[PDB]
Design a binder for these strands. Structure first.
Lengths: 90, 102, 78, 95, 8, 95, 79, 98, 90, 7
DNA sequence: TCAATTGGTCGTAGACAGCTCTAGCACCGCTTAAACGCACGTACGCGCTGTCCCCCGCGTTTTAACCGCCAAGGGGATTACTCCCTAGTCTCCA
DNA sequence: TGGAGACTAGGGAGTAATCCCCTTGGCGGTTAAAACGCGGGGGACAGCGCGTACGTGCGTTTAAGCGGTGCTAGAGCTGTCTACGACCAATTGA
């Protein structure tokens, strides 16, 4: 949470190879990632609490994503999360 | 190699793991929770950056500024629903004049 | 006393950014009152967050948190 | 120019820019005046006053966007304080 | 190939 | 009776009552028909459907309050879909 | 199919009268039906998400209560 | 612990709830006492207005209608419980003058 | 989840002869469990914000002052500070 | 001496 | 009969004293961009008049909601195996 | 000088089985509510006229903003050290 500036830079590098980003735009992207992190993690905590569970795992994160993200955004985010866990487990 | 390159990501799954375990969300944190969170965060970041870089190129610019981020978010219905209570600093508004006034 | 420093040109600029064509003369005092109420609500919470940390200066995070708790999350100030 | 194409030009100009539409010094003075009612000898960061202004201006612009809709609903192009009151009452700010 | 979304 | 007096009596009648104003069986069938698009063979606790009806009825009554405000804003007595759309858009439900 | 017509015009104007409305346009009933359908689709989706996370098949009043909390509407009296 | 503070709400149960709810790694000693004193005061404030509303309706019991009538007729409790639906509570009797 | 006994007992000292319906106390249980989770979530935040690991009566005070409106906070804080004084009095 | 509120 | 309290270690969390240097404030001067005041005209708000159409009130007819009362089975809580799971710890040079 | 790799161990969750309750399905009767038609009337909307208030332009004034100067409060980080909460064991009563 100290910064995602390196990682937002890598993603921008791989998405728009030539386009750079401003120092004020990066602060907004860091705020965006910190806000979305909090939103997903708090919902995952509530999800674990409702089920009387003491661990937060991939299912809690995915269900929090589906609850939070609207429409097709949720479908594609769920697909990317699933692919990442599938490749990491392998 | 690294835990982000294990998953094929760019966001740090180790850092997300530490933030999950320090934030008092649960007594325990699973192994795939940091990876899933990092993947979803990376996907949303990539979406916003792609649309922002498209908007900046429509303004004949080679640098994303907060105005381009606001344009990209407000012009996408799903991202507008996601960030619907969010104020973007130095972002402005969508250019929209009511048809009655014209 | 400094509510009249939010001048009529400034309020009219804010309205033109909102898409307003004509502005009645009684709008400016109403806008000043509304801004006064909004600023009071945010600043009370920000100062509460300031005194809690036993600080004497109001931090940008103190404002950002006082806004997050009114459902007006603001990106760009950490 | 007649009465009202300069208004449209201004709408286009200020809907295209992203600057702060309120002067910084009077707004800072207002912020300090309001804060003194809660704590005495309060200090402020420059980023704190800038965040307050960035939030206040966005809130006011968004409220004017709803005031305009309330004015169009009543077959009018002039926004009036009753439009502000209706918009604020509907979004639950103050009944 | 730039990282381009498949989203609508 | 003159048109409106029975309307005011009906307002007073349904404003001091607390019962649910929609029939329970049609609302239950609507709820199951809607839920059929998200999962099949879905059972429902009776309290679940009762909570859905209470929330839906409170939501519609609160929305009709705003619709009536938008009707009065346009110097009218009859609520029109225009008013519902204005209330929903200012509430943020719509665009 | 076509269970939205079970929310009849008399029930809609009963809710309108509780909302303080005197006169109602004849196009209000379809608009209200669409609005109610939107609200119910939004709530019974979070409710079914909460239900499937619990690996259950009955939708509990607690799932509805939480799905209402998620949309900012707190409900009192159902546990 | 509830008797020492002069409370009626359970300080021990608030303590266990605070510890189990993972609100912080540690929970203090006056935290449950303060929290119970806050919940009990708010409960007594609602239960007085709803109960005055029960005598204003010539009732000897309190129903959800009385709780809603008490909450919405109090500006502070209405602002506090502003996004709260009370089941079988109705609405405040109110007709516009057009 | 169930505060029925204590809501009954506070009722007897404010309105001795008045009763509560089953649905009316199923509502006050929701009110108590809601305001408890409001204060314990704001106080949880106020501890993290100061990089603090314990929730104290100071944080409960600040959360009550942030969540409760106007004169509710003035009168709830004055009762919280009076029940701790008596709790820790010899 | 019923318990009342000074609010 | 288990929960609500009590008593006694122990270790760390946090309070307090002491520097440190950042940044917040107070002030001045110059420039000038923006605010302010006035004069004017016209467009828009608002108040009438008139039409007519659509909504309401009411008197029948119909329909299906609601209330009991049976019958069956799914599936939500439990409770004891069972192990796979993560927190914890140590090494450790990226 | 953070997270990655490799063990160790307790325990949280997964699984099979049970059990009962509560959800669904059917049926019949009653009557309350929905639906349908009809006849007015009142409210919505259109058109017109008036007058005043708001936009516009111009000239004057006034503080905002920028660029320096300087001073010090207080935020921020150590370093110490103690006292208070976690943990465990007794214990006893609602």
């Amino acid at each position: 949470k100290e910064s995602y500036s390196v990682y937002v830079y890598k993603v921008l590098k791989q998405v728009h190879p030539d386009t750079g980003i401003s120092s004020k735009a990066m602060g907004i992207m860091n705020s965006f990632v910190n806000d979305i992190f909090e939103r997903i993690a708090g919902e995952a905590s509530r999800l674990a609490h409702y089920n009387k569970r003491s661990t937060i795992t991939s299912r809690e994160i995915q269900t929090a994503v589906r609850l939070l993200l609207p429409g097709e955004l949720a479908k594609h985010a769920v697909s990317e999360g699933t692919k990442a866990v599938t490749k990491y487990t392998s | 190699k690294s835990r982000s390159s294990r998953a094929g990501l760019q966001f740090p799954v180790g850092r997300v793991h530490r933030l999950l375990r320090k934030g008092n969300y649960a007594e325990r944190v699973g192994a795939g929770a940091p990876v899933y969170m990092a993947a979803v965060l990376e996907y949303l970041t990539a979406e916003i950056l792609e649309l922002a870089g498209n908007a900046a190129r429509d303004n004949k610019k080679t640098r994303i500024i907060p105005r381009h981020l606001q344009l990209a978010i407000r012009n996408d219905e799903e991202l507008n629903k996601l960030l619907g209570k969010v104020t973007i600093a130095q972002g402005g508004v969508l250019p929209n004049i009511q048809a009655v006034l014209l | 006393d400094n509510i009249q420093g939010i001048t009529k040109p400034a309020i009219r600029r804010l309205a033109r950014r909102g898409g307003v064509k004509r502005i009645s003369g009684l709008i400016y005092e109403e806008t000043r009152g509304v801004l006064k109420v909004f600023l009071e609500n945010v600043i009370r919470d920000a100062v509460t967050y300031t005194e809690h940390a036993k600080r004497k200066t109001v931090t940008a995070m103190d404002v950002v948190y006082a806004l997050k708790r009114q459902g007006r999350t603001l990106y760009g100030f950490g | 120019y007649r009465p009202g194409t300069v208004a449209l030009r201004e709408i286009r100009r200020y809907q295209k820019s992203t600057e702060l539409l309120i002067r910084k010094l009077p707004f800072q003075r207002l912020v300090r005046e309001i804060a003194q009612d809660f704590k005495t000898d309060l200090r402020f960061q420059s980023s704190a006053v800038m965040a307050l202004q960035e939030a206040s201006e966005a809130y006011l612009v968004g409220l004017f966007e709803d005031t305009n809709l309330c004015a169009i609903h009543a077959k009018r192009v002039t926004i009036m304080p009753k439009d502000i009151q209706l918009a604020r009452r509907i979004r639950g700010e103050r009944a | 190939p730039p990282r381009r979304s498949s989203r609508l």
